[PDB]
Amino acid sequence: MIQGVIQKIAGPAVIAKGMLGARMYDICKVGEEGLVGEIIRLDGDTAFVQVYEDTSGLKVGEPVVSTGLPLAVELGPGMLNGIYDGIQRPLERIREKTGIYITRGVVVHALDREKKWAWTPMVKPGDEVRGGMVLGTVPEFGFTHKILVPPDVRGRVKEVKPAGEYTVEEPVVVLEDGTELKMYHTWPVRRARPVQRKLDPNTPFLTGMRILDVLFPVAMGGTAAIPGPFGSGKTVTQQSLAKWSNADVVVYVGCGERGNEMTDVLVEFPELTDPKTGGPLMHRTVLIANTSNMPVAAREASIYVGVTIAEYFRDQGFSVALMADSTSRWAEALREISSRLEEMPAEEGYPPYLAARLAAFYERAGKVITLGGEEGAVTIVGAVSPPGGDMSEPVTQSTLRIVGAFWRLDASLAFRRHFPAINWNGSYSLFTSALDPWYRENVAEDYPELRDAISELLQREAGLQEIVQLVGPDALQDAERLVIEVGRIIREDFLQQNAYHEVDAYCSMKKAYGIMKMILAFYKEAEAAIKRGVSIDEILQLPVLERIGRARYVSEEEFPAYFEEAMKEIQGAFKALA
Amino acid sequence: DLLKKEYTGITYISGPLLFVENAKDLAYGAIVDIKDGTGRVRGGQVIEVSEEYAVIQVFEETTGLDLATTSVSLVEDVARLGVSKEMLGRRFNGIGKPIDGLPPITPEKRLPITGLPLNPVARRKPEQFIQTGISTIDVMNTLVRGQKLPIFSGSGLPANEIAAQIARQATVRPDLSGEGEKEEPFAVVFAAMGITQRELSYFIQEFERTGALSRSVLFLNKADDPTIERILTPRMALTVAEYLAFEHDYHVLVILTDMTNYCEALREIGAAREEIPGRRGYPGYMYTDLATIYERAGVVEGKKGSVTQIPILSMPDDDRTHPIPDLTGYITEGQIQLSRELHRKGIYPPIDPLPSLSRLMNNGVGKGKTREDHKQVSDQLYSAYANGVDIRKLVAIIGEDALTENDRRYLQFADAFERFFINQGQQNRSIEESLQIAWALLSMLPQGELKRISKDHIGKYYGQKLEEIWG
Amino acid sequence: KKEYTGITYISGPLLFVENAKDLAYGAIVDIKDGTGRVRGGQVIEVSEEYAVIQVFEETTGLDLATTSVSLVEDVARLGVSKEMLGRRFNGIGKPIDGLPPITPEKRLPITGLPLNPVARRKPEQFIQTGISTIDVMNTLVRGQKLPIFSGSGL
Ligand SMILES: Nc1ncnc2c1ncn2[C@@H]1O[C@H](COP(=O)(O)OP(=O)(O)O)[C@@H](O)[C@H]1O
């Protein structure tokens, strides 16, 4: 293979010479230690390599060897309940081989070669096979991991192994062509795994948060973006989605963020319970971690590794939720590499191809028909960190044109400790109309009417605050004061949610429906009582306001009695006030 | 080895950069010695090497150098610091040389100053509550052992006095936490970058009066010292702190005097090399460079010691959206922000609670740690104060006499809050006293307005009077 | 027919080919590599010594040893016919609905000539769009350019 020597070292970038015949985006070994690198520019006899590890201590003249293959991940059993770095190395074995610090040049297999799995075949000799078809089944933490033919492999079965226990290296199916299929295979991270047909979004993604589940829904195959300044609530929202959503498999990508949050996930999750399985919550989670003090060039690789793993779990018939902790650090890394290449920058110094990468990353999401005929889906939620809270950032504007949902956060709401601090005035969802047939079947026949009625009250309150800031709240009429008070009730009681409370952290759909029904019934009764001459300040002294104001903290199995008690108290209040 | 290799043939000197041609044997990131024609030796570091030529940045000033008599010799391939337990009680300059007149340290180890990343598996959750004696911090922005909690300050505001008071009054509370284990006092590692004589003389006297110099290591880079030395100082300080914490089970408190000077020193070198800038001319890799400094704190599983950081930085023109505060807040676990408006009124310490934040508060408070009503009281105070501030804003438009009684209650609450809870002077308060004052303040409001507090806690604690404590 | 193998530089979307002065400016070329895959491209700069080609899609797998470039067409042209009604295309005329490609009645350059201002006439007949707020108050006339200004969630 191609072998050369180092010519120039400067930070994360190494230029090697004598590399004629090397191909673009192949993986190289740099130096005597063997640091992993990637070719990004060919110029005559030389090549430009970005190194995925720290380059301090290197000297000019050390050998460079090209493997001739692009970056690839190993896909197979044994990936759940594990934590990986940016280029898929298990951290809990680096912890064994090294101290408490991460060093250079550690070579670990991604999948354990010593664990033995219970193999059960499905194909028999003489069968025709094709990419995407199932070969066998292996149990894993209550799942049934299905061994798949690689997407580009075709042939006829010659012999299979019987039922028994084998490692992932043992060949189970041998074809007439001579190829041997193992329990795992490798796939390049920059190539999207092929599908058969894309489907329509018609099933909601339940997050457990009232505002996101009701006002700004997202479908099972949709994409959403959550931008905001620092200390607004992105990380807590994404971890709540990891804890409480109804997805089968959750993939978490910590691109360029703190290590303490990864430690928090690693510690807290094994004590929790899966909402649909009953086992530990960590048995369905894959963590890809690349903290801020880890090397810069590995930030780009972690996103592709995570999305490739999420696509692999889609092909088995699962629904996967993918959370990207910060996609702004990816853009910052691309800007940092571009300074060494001496290219002409675009606006804000980013390389001109930034918008193509983001568009190609969000395009992988959706509900598909797999090559094996099953039905799976991948949904992506990506956080954006604009500099200084400037929403006109190029990354924010590029993300805004391709996502189907947009959950904007506000710093002013976060200052006063009003969470989740979603800015209602600048947020939207494009999946609201397509999910209406599902809500009528599963929640209630009148649910869209209630949601629209709540939206009308919020819009009317928003249109009246321009007068309160001008002449004070006490200059308005009685009905306007009632509208303001009901808007305050909605804002304080329905939208607000404490993620650290024992009961309020998770809210089902029917509980939110009941709360909306209670609020609308109170609003209509108060509006009727206004016409009878009753003053507005008399109405807000009623004890039924406490019942609505504390319906959040009622347990899930105690809510049906509380709702029917409150609906009777509503009649008991206004029929005796005047 | 004993051998040393000389390099003549310098071809370009300008500003902080020096160029040497036939030097392909210098490793990237190595430390060099630059010898003048008069025999004076200055330091340097290789920042780009090639088989054609090499680029060296110079720490000291370039006065007196020339292209005919200057020579460059290699010191070591990787920048290292000799660390020892003997460093406690010593003073060093920005590059680790003694300035107290004592003989140098006999090393036990030689550790790289760039450091290595901590493995996320090897960490653990910081949960030990630290009592600083300031009500605005202990109750609403609680600090735990192993946290990074910078202080956001202005030009004329007293951040140094607050830092000294925190270092003087900080202690854990074993009786509340149920551990029962007493502690030795904190070891303080102090790193100054571009500090003036007026502040340094205050810090030295404050450390002398409390007897903390016997447990302290000081790294001093003054304002009349060379600028490029500021790149090394936080790395030296954090290397010593990490060695002491994770090798000898010390509890280390780290104070960095001004990160604004560090960012200016970084911008000078970045503009010399013509990097692609970010906002306001700062280099595009400033987020990564700052990340390697802050992320060296925390707690390690299976080890007793810990590192706690209190960086101090000044916001230019009191702007929170300047690149330095923005990139600092995107990394750290919170911040403490001072208010000039509170400082004008004589309130000390002038901590503004609304923009302040502590991310690790939920780990170290609650039942069995401080008290069962900590978090709900903290939330209710925030909501009531925000309502009071909004009513203050509305009064300036519509006038005070048009207010109802409900708005006047919140106005008086905000006034009493500022005059009694934030303003405490130099006195030391336990957590119980702070919670008692907070409950006394909340008793002014109607009982039905305490939405965020559970009814059992309200029945247990409501009904205090503030005037009995002082009158 | 002719194929140029003098590649000297590959970075991002651009590549340089030496001794390629025969290529016209704006010409469409195809890039063939060692795996047999064929990519598209466009010449954006011609000189005496080399030409610059902007490549469609990614540049993964290309190398300076085996890559070759051939000429497809001097200018970008489109084959048009009355059988295009009822068809879907991908943006460069390639059908995507699965039907056989249309036979071209003519081949026309996609960069059209300007209209002579003296050959125009005044628009005087309207179009019924079926929307009240457009048909009544903002009526659209045959030959008008009337954009719609929208927002993010609209
Ligand atoms: N739903 C919520 N309930 C309670 N507290 C919250 C909620 N969301 C955010 N917070 C608070 O806001 C802070 C924001 O933290 P984090 O989300 O990690 O920062 P960022 O949004 O900059 O990533 C946290 O310390 C947390 O205590």
Ligand SMILES: [Mg+2]
């Ligand atoms: Mg975060």
